């Protein structure tokens, strides 16, 4: 009924060394199930639908998505924490800013989530490479989403982005 505290939509992220990512990953099967890496971590991204079960890994409700994974590029980890005050315009910015993401070049899909019981929300962007995201910077929802993470390192907390790509053929 209000998806916002109760939907079943998830994202799963685990992070950790190659190796053992590799090892949870062959445990598990479907969902999109995605190893991720940059210079420092790898990770793995994992949608399903319910509750948790024995899923590693910080669990995230996914308030909207859009467009579908390539399966190629690089993927954008936004965090942020929002005061209760500022949460519904945020959904609501985000929304009306995300009926023109079809319009964004070399965006292929975009998660709205939030950490389970906690103010604080993950924005996952999945590009085809990262010029393409850097273009996305000059955006007016990318300034607000900066602002927003600057203003959240100020006070408490750590908001910050991490770029990840798909790991080597």
Do not use: C
């Amino acid at each position: 009924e209000n998806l916002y505290f109760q939907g079943m939509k998830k994202v799963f992220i685990t992070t950790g060394t190659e190796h053992y990512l590799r090892q949870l990953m062959a445990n598990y099967t479907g969902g999109n199930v995605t190893l991720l890496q940059n210079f420092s971590q790898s990770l793995l991204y994992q949608e399903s639908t319910g509750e948790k079960l024995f899923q590693e890994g910080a669990e995230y409700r996914v308030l909207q998505s859009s467009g579908s994974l390539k399966g190629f590029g690089v993927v954008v980890f936004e965090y942020i924490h929002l005061r209760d005050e500022e949460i519904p315009i945020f959904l609501q910015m985000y929304q009306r800013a995300s009926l023109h993401f079809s319009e964004t070049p070399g965006l292929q899909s975009t998660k709205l989530t939030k950490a389970m019981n906690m103010n604080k929300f993950l924005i996952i962007s999945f590009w085809d490479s990262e010029v393409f995201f850097h273009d996305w910077k000059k955006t007016p929802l990318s300034k607000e989403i900066t602002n927003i993470m600057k203003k959240n390192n100020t006070q408490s907390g750590f908001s910050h982005e991490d770029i990840y790509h798909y790991p080597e053929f």
